[PDB]
Amino acid sequence: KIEVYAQPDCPPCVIVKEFLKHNNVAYEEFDVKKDAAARNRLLYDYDSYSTPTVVIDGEVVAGFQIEKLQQLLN
Amino acid sequence: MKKIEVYAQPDCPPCVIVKEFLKHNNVAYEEFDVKKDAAARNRLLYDYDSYSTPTVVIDGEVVAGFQIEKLQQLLNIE
């Protein structure tokens, strides 16, 4: 239900994950570097060019925006 | 006071998030551990009127707790 799209050497990705963990959010994570299917979903399903991208109930939070995770997750 | 002060402690994920945010933005801050540094703890509580970490002081202005957008604004970094 919550999906995190991340890639190597991505400091904002690590930060977003720590925020989700601290909030005990139940997410699944994908690597758009290793995983071409995840990459295609990032571009074609979510119309996003960058990581981190977080999808919450199909709402797309693209790039490094810690305050919106707070908005949409509670 | 240093221009940018970060008050933190161990086992404080919001503190880690704030410090990493500041690092990613290449902010020139000084940090203090209020568990290990009793003087820093006293400044947090008695000078800055804040009861928890993270607390960031930016040119004298106290930002208590996890306030990323307010940090961004005060640091003139966005």
For residue A67, the chain B residues in CB contact (below 8 A) are 68-69
Mutate one of B12, B18, B63, B68 to test the A interface: name it (highest A CB count within 10 A).
B68
Residues 6+ apart with CB under 8 A from A4: A13, A16, A17, A20, A27, A28, A29, A30, A52, A53, A54
Which domains does chain A show, CATH number per domain? Answer: 1-74 (3.40.30.10)
What resolution in angstroms, rounded to 1 decimal?
Answer: 1.2
From chain B, pick out residues whose CB is under 8 angstroms from the CB of A18: 13, 16-17, 20
Q: Do B24 and A12 touch (CB under 8 A)?
A: yes
Method of elucidation: X-ray
With b for 16 or more beta-carbon neighbours within 10 A and e for fewer, the A14-25 pattern comes to ebbbbbbeeeeb
Secondary structure of residue B33 in the 3-state scheme: strand
Helix (H, G, I), strand (E, B) or coil at B4: strand
| Cβ pairs bridging A and B (under 8 Å) | 25
